[PDB]
Design a protein around this ligand. Sequence first.
Ligand SMILES: [Cl-]
Ligand SMILES: [Cl-]
Lengths: 497, 497
Amino acid sequence: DPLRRTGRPFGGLIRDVRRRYPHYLSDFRDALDPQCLAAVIFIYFAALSPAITFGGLLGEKTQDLIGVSELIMSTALQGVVFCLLGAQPLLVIGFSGPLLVFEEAFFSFCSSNHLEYLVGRVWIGFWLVFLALLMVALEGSFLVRFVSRFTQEIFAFLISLIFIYETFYKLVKIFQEHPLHGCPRGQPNTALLSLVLMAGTFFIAFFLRKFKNSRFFPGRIRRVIGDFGVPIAILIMVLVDYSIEDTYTQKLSVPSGFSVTAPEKRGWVINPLGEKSPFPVWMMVASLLPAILVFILIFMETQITTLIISKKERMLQKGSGFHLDLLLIVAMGGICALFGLPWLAAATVRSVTHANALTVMVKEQRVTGLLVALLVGLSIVIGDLLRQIPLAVLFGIFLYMGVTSLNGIQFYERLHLLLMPPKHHPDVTYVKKVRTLRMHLFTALQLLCLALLWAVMSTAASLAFPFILILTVPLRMVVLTRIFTDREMKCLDANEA
Amino acid sequence: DPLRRTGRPFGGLIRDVRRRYPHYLSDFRDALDPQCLAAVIFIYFAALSPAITFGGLLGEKTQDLIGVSELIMSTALQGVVFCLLGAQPLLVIGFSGPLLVFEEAFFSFCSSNHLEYLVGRVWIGFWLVFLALLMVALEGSFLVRFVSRFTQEIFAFLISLIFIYETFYKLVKIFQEHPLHGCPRGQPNTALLSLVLMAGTFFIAFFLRKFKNSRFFPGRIRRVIGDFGVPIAILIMVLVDYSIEDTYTQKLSVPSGFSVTAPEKRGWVINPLGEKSPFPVWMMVASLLPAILVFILIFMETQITTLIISKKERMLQKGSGFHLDLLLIVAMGGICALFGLPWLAAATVRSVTHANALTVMVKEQRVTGLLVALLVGLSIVIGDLLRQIPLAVLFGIFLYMGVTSLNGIQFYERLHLLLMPPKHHPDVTYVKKVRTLRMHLFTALQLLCLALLWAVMSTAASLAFPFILILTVPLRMVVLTRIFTDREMKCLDANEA
Ligand SMILES: [Cl-]
Ligand SMILES: [Cl-]
């Protein structure tokens, strides 16, 4: 197995290279199927829409220092380089929710302590490259074994709650900037039209997702339309806002062709020594802690995704790489942070959608991910026609993604059962073989950990949010094992089900 | 069976009296169960909300000649008199959709031909009383046998389409009276807030209806909350509109205590000879045709409801009356039309909800319906706190009722199957035993009849909408029997399933 640890330095990296790179020409040869174009069209929007949404979020939170342009360029460049060199090109590299939360937290830290944001990110990137080299040299990737279900499900629930909270906080911000008063700020109809666009996009996307699973059309047409749940909802609720002539709604506001979102504030190359202000020498050495906290999120997400899409059920013949992908993502993000771009991590939802796109009932082609990255990059050449998409539509898609990512989490299912009567619980292993007062005790402990994570994230110590997260790994191995029994833990924390 | 025809005049009426009135004291004795109060609370809102919605619709369409006050008083008075004298007090008497459509059509007819609305209604009522006496004397109620499923389902689909069309037409009227322009008519935020209130009420009511059938709370609490799907949605979306301070939304606008909605236009007693304008002698004799068309709707709805709630599955021990209820509703409406009140008909949805409220797994009590009618009447003593309910909330409930009344119609189910692949059709009698190209032929013929009804309703000949409706009775007995076979008709037009 790839996670086996050998004494030789860079054992995992060398094994992954010697496992995947001999199939380099076959990776391009296998892409000639007509299904690959359908997969590209399917996942291009599922990669582009999160990119622009998180670019808008970064522009709002970090005062346009990092925005839609920087995030689009980073996603495209890192996608191209990874798909050309990564061990598992079926991984879809993109900006994630927890990364956005941490970048907002780090920006708040820099603003509070009078530190420049981008230079601090440059030094976090340098330490990230050092940590990636060290971990891959010592083959620390086997630590992904210790990330149980108890931690993965808390993390995914945290991501989805982040999405929901950000959408609703943006809605409240709109309702406070444009209050409902009779006769830009104070504009009438803007708050209600933004709410209507958000709700309409969410409902169209949700109902098309349900229609994908429904039985109302030919089986091919149902799936084809359902895979376009997000593009069709965005198109419809953008045409609706285009038809309205006089009302003001906030638009996406991408910058001109190949430009920085804030040309006055920053250039492309961030000065690591200091940008118009001498960066202190204590922070360039103290950025080890934020680098560790970022590396925790990147490692957890990328390695969990690699575990998810490397299952024998997926039938991946060539085999993914746990070490090569981790190095090629963390080092790439560390180098990108020198140019003021956001570091990324292989996102599980996009990668799973891409993998399911190539399943034949797996194509294993680099060119699909490569072309998706290139199209995401050319979406800034598009320029206009992206600054006509209202932010309300993108936040509706944001809420739709946040709600639908909860589906399939065993934590969420056991949260449902906290309300249902004991007779109505479904016939699953953690219900049949665990007493209900014990299943609910486990759910309550997981809720306590999630609430502690959310409280740490909301307070002034938001930087320590990744570390507290991995504190759920020793807990499950030290505390929860001494509270619960082995029979209960083998059913509640089942590695697979 | 009650529908058996005997030679003696008023045979059905006499049989129904001799069947039900000996249980007169037992009807009051059986009401002492604590479940009766819960039933009253359940159905009081399901009777009041349609009353106020249709009063607002009548005020809009007929220029406030008949409104919320007249409809509330008519519903209360007719409910009290029926529950005191009717053979089946479990029938809930209330204004229905088709009656509203016909009153709008008759008002348009009167306006086009320079005729007074209320005097024309007085003469329609007199002819209605004559027709009720004649039919009950000759025992024509057995004609309800000939109203097949083919006609009942077309009628119910027409009612639901009427509800949906009226809600969306009111929404478009709001968006045209208060257009979305930057800086009562022309008010900002009114169109969008009305849309938001309508959608919110519809979604809250729909999701509480689903929660009634869900499994997320104790089985008693689930049903108790779900039975309050409409009151809770109305309360929440009225408090939401109350919180908003500056935006203008159209309110229900009931008049003062025990007053006419238009005191200047009309008094309580409508002059049958002519009200400030000599009513011509040709119309007082020509109102036979509108009386026939109204009697068709009243007869169809009341007798179909009596059939529905008199099934042996319902376990009605005392037994309903087909003739006594028809006479006591048509004659009562004819007399009420003399006082400018809208005639009513026993509505199937409210009556079925009332009957299910008293089922023990049937109480058969007059006092529940009597108290519901009295509370509906006192709702005009409430006065204020009803003119704070925005019309958007009531139209959201209107759309919710229109959508949920489609459920259970075999016509609607066979409209679903017109899209699904033949493999996914459910295992039901009209699917297994009928070839799919024949089931869809039947559905297409029913759609053609429904479209002809809708086109006749929309054009200038809207008065002939009831007559065309009963033309579907000979058709199914003359045309559809010569197209389809007996094996197919016995499964598609199944009298029960
Ligand atoms: Cl994600
Ligand atoms: Cl109704």
